[PDB]
Design an enzyme around this catalytic site. Sequence first.
Site, PDB file in Angstrom:
ATOM      1  N   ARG A 133      10.569  39.023 -13.894  1.00  0.00           N
ATOM      2  CA  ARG A 133      10.608  38.900 -12.436  1.00  0.00           C
ATOM      3  C   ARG A 133       9.312  38.259 -11.944  1.00  0.00           C
ATOM      4  O   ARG A 133       8.355  38.941 -11.557  1.00  0.00           O
ATOM      5  CB  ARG A 133      10.869  40.267 -11.776  1.00  0.00           C
ATOM      6  N   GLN A 158      24.441  35.388 -14.290  1.00  0.00           N
ATOM      7  CA  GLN A 158      23.694  34.502 -13.395  1.00  0.00           C
ATOM      8  C   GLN A 158      22.486  33.868 -14.093  1.00  0.00           C
ATOM      9  O   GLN A 158      21.717  34.562 -14.764  1.00  0.00           O
ATOM     10  CB  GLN A 158      23.247  35.294 -12.162  1.00  0.00           C
ATOM     11  N   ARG A 167      16.489  32.219 -20.363  1.00  0.00           N
ATOM     12  CA  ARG A 167      15.472  33.183 -19.926  1.00  0.00           C
ATOM     13  C   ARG A 167      15.626  34.587 -20.538  1.00  0.00           C
ATOM     14  O   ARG A 167      14.758  35.468 -20.332  1.00  0.00           O
ATOM     15  CB  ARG A 167      15.446  33.251 -18.389  1.00  0.00           C
ATOM     16  N   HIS A 186      12.574  28.023 -12.321  1.00  0.00           N
ATOM     17  CA  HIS A 186      12.641  28.996 -11.208  1.00  0.00           C
ATOM     18  C   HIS A 186      11.235  29.420 -10.739  1.00  0.00           C
ATOM     19  O   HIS A 186      10.858  30.589 -10.817  1.00  0.00           O
ATOM     20  CB  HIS A 186      13.521  30.192 -11.611  1.00  0.00           C
ATOM     21  N   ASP A 240      17.666  31.005   1.259  1.00  0.00           N
ATOM     22  CA  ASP A 240      18.259  30.646  -0.032  1.00  0.00           C
ATOM     23  C   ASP A 240      19.007  29.327   0.149  1.00  0.00           C
ATOM     24  O   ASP A 240      20.186  29.296   0.524  1.00  0.00           O
ATOM     25  CB  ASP A 240      19.171  31.796  -0.498  1.00  0.00           C
ATOM     26  N   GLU A 242      12.037  25.559  -6.435  1.00  0.00           N
ATOM     27  CA  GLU A 242      12.602  25.460  -7.803  1.00  0.00           C
ATOM     28  C   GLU A 242      13.238  24.080  -8.040  1.00  0.00           C
ATOM     29  O   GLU A 242      14.351  23.815  -7.586  1.00  0.00           O
ATOM     30  CB  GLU A 242      13.675  26.563  -7.979  1.00  0.00           C
TER      31      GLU A 242
HETATM   32  O1  TA6 Z   1      17.735  38.071  -9.798  1.00  0.00           O
HETATM   33  P1  TA6 Z   1      17.895  36.749 -10.515  1.00  0.00           P
HETATM   34  O2  TA6 Z   1      19.167  36.586 -11.338  1.00  0.00           O
HETATM   35  O3  TA6 Z   1      16.613  36.350 -11.221  1.00  0.00           O
HETATM   36  O4  TA6 Z   1      18.100  35.649  -9.344  1.00  0.00           O
HETATM   37  C1  TA6 Z   1      17.054  35.483  -8.381  1.00  0.00           C
HETATM   38  C2  TA6 Z   1      17.370  34.416  -7.337  1.00  0.00           C
HETATM   39  O5  TA6 Z   1      17.860  33.185  -7.859  1.00  0.00           O
HETATM   40  C3  TA6 Z   1      18.546  32.496  -6.776  1.00  0.00           C
HETATM   41  O6  TA6 Z   1      19.872  32.100  -7.145  1.00  0.00           O
HETATM   42  C4  TA6 Z   1      17.745  31.249  -6.393  1.00  0.00           C
HETATM   43  O7  TA6 Z   1      16.340  31.530  -6.391  1.00  0.00           O
HETATM   44  C5  TA6 Z   1      18.679  33.497  -5.612  1.00  0.00           C
HETATM   45  O8  TA6 Z   1      19.980  33.539  -4.972  1.00  0.00           O
HETATM   46  C6  TA6 Z   1      18.367  34.828  -6.261  1.00  0.00           C
HETATM   47  O9  TA6 Z   1      19.569  35.412  -6.797  1.00  0.00           O
HETATM   48 BA    BA Z   2      21.954  35.452  -5.030  1.00  0.00          BA
END
Ligand code: TA6
Ligand code: BA
Length: 288
Positions: free
Chosen positions: A56, A80, A85, A158, A202, A263
Site C-alpha cells: 500500500r 483487481q 504486484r 501506480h 478517480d 499513474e
Molecule cells: O486497493 P487497490 O487494488 O490497490 O486499488 C487502489 C486504487 O486503484 C485505482 O483503480 C486507481 O488508482 C482506484 O480505483 C483504487 O481502487
Molecule cells: Ba476502485
Amino acid sequence: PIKETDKEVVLTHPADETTSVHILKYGATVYSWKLKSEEQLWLSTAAKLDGSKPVRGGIPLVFPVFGKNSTDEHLSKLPQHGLARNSTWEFLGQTKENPPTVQFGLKPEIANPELTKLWPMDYLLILTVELGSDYLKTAIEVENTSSSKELKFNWLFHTYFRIEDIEGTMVSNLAGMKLYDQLLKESYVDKHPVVTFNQETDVIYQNVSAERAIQIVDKGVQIHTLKRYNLPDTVVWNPWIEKSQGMADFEPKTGYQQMICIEPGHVHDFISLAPGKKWNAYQLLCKE
Ligand SMILES: O=P(O)(O)OC[C@H]1O[C@](O)(CO)[C@@H](O)[C@H]1O
Ligand SMILES: [Ba+2]
C-alpha cells in the site's frame, strides 16, 4: 552503490548517498525514493512489505489488467490490477554503477502460482530502475514469449507521490484533456486550468504524450514532475476519507492528505503483442 539483501535491493547515488531508492523483490515494488534525504513517495505505515499482499504505497506495478475486467474470458479471472504486484520478481543484477541501474524479471514459472493458474499466458517482463542525481526512472519491457498466441494486456505504474497537504495541492498541464471519471461513470473534457482536490477523485486522462510533463504544485513550488514514454493514459486518484478508513492496510487514516496518485499507463484499451514481439515504456520522475 548497489546493495542486495534477501528481500530487497537498495540503490544509493555515488555523488550523494542520501539519494536512494529501495526496491522490494516482491512485486519489484519501489517503496521509497529519497532525494537528498527527502522521501518522494508515500507509503502507508501499515503497508505490508513481507509479500503477504501488494504494497500500500510506493510504485505498485499493474499488469496484465488495470482495475477489474468483466469482458474478457481470461483477464476477468484475475483480481483487481492483475498479478505483477502479487509476484516475487527475480533480481537480474546491476547494469551500471553511475547512475546506479538494476533489472528485475518476471515470467510465469516464477510468478504467483494461484494467479498464474487463472491467467496462464506466456510473457517475460524486464523492469529497469535507474537512480539519477535528481530523477528516478522505471522502465518496462514486455516480450510475448509465446510462439503461437497473441498477448493482450494493460500496463500501469501506480505511483504514490508524497505531498504535504492534499487540499493545498494542484496538478498542472492536464487542462483541456479528455478523461473518463471512474466515480461518475462518464467521459468529459477537463475544463479546469489546474486539478484541485476536495473529495474522492478517480479519473483516467487520455492522450498524454512524451512531450507533456505533469507538475504537482504546492505553495507555488513544483514539488514533483512526471514524464513518461509510451503510456498515453494517466490515472489520478485520491481515496479521500471514507475509502481510506475502509482500507485495512492504509494508515494513518488522515494519510490521504499526504498522497496523490498520478499513474502513467496504457489502460484505455489493451495492447496486443504478436508472438515474439516486444513493447516498452517508462515513467520518469523528477523535481523541475
Ligand atoms: O486497493 P487497490 O487494488 O490497490 O486499488 C487502489 C486504487 O486503484 C485505482 O483503480 C486507481 O488508482 C482506484 O480505483 C483504487 O481502487
Ligand atoms: Ba476502485
